[PDB]
Design a protein around this ligand. Structure first.
Ligand SMILES: C[C@@H]1CN(c2cc(F)c3c(c2)N(C)C(=O)C32CCN(c3nc4c(c(=O)[nH]3)CCCN4C)CC2)C[C@H](C)O1
Ligand SMILES: [Zn+2]
Lengths: 46, 162
């Protein structure tokens, strides 16, 4: 798809969950660089 | 032409990236269905992704965007989880493989919450969980996220009921 006319990305901002941070959408692969590769496990809550 | 450079946990750059991972975990309204139940990660490895051609491709576009947006690339560092992380690091992002069913249009999605991106490491909605145990909340299997430099430029503000 294409970005909104005159825009380079979309900011998706939660308006219900106040603790949820934003999500972002770009429409050209050239606008992101995969800078860090993070290997991890989720941890079981104590 | 991608090279992965292991960062030492003693290195401030490792500790900085870990802190971004850990500090942006949140609770998810699916109760952990997609990404599992956790408050924190065990970070096993952080590698810098080095690829000259992909970097030049990014900085070239960053410059175009900057010039179209009062000299402001609006560059962020954002998470991205995907089953295709190994392809992304070698081939770069590719909008011909956008997320067709995303809430905000068919594009490439990134998150400020590391735990939101974690919901996609095993597939959409966690898919069927880790390949070995079929457990979306697997505490055993290793996961991988990307922490990406993302040019937003002029960003269309879409408010969502999430
Ligand atoms: C032919 C198909 C391919 N298929 C599949 C699976 C899949 F998991 C994806 C794709 C494809 N494609 C194109 C993708 O883009 C994603 C990966 C990343 N992804 C994402 N979405 C995020 C955030 C984030 O970090 N990563 C955070 C912000 C919020 N958000 C929505 C979206 C889903 C597997 C299936 C069995 O066969
Ligand atoms: Zn597993």
């Amino acid at each position: 798809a294409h970005s909104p006319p005159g825009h380079h990305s979309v900011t998706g901002r939660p308006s219900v969950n106040g603790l949820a941070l934003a999500e972002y959408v770009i429409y050209r692969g050239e606008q992101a660089y995969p800078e860090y590769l993070i290997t991890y496990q989720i941890m079981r809550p104590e | 032409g991608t090279i992965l450079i292991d960062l030492s946990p003693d290195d401030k750059e490792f500790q900085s990236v870990e802190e971004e991972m850990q500090s942006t975990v949140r609770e998810h309204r699916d109760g952990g269905h997609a990404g599992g139940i956790f408050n924190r990660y065990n970070i096993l490895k952080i590698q810098k992704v080095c690829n000259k051609k992909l970097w030049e491709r990014y900085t070239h576009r960053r410059k175009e965007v900057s010039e179209e947006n009062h000299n402001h690339a609006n560059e962020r560092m954002l998470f991205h989880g995907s089953p295709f992380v190994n392809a992304i690091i070698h081939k770069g992002f590719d909008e011909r493989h956008a997320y067709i069913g995303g809430m905000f249009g068919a594009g490439i999605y990134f998150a400020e919450n590391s735990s939101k991106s974690n919901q996609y490491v095993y597939g959409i909605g966690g898919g069927t969980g880790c390949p070995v145990h079929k457990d979306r909340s697997c505490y055993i299997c290793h996961r991988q996220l990307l922490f990406c430099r993302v040019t937003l430029g002029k960003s269309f503000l879409q408010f969502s009921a999430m």
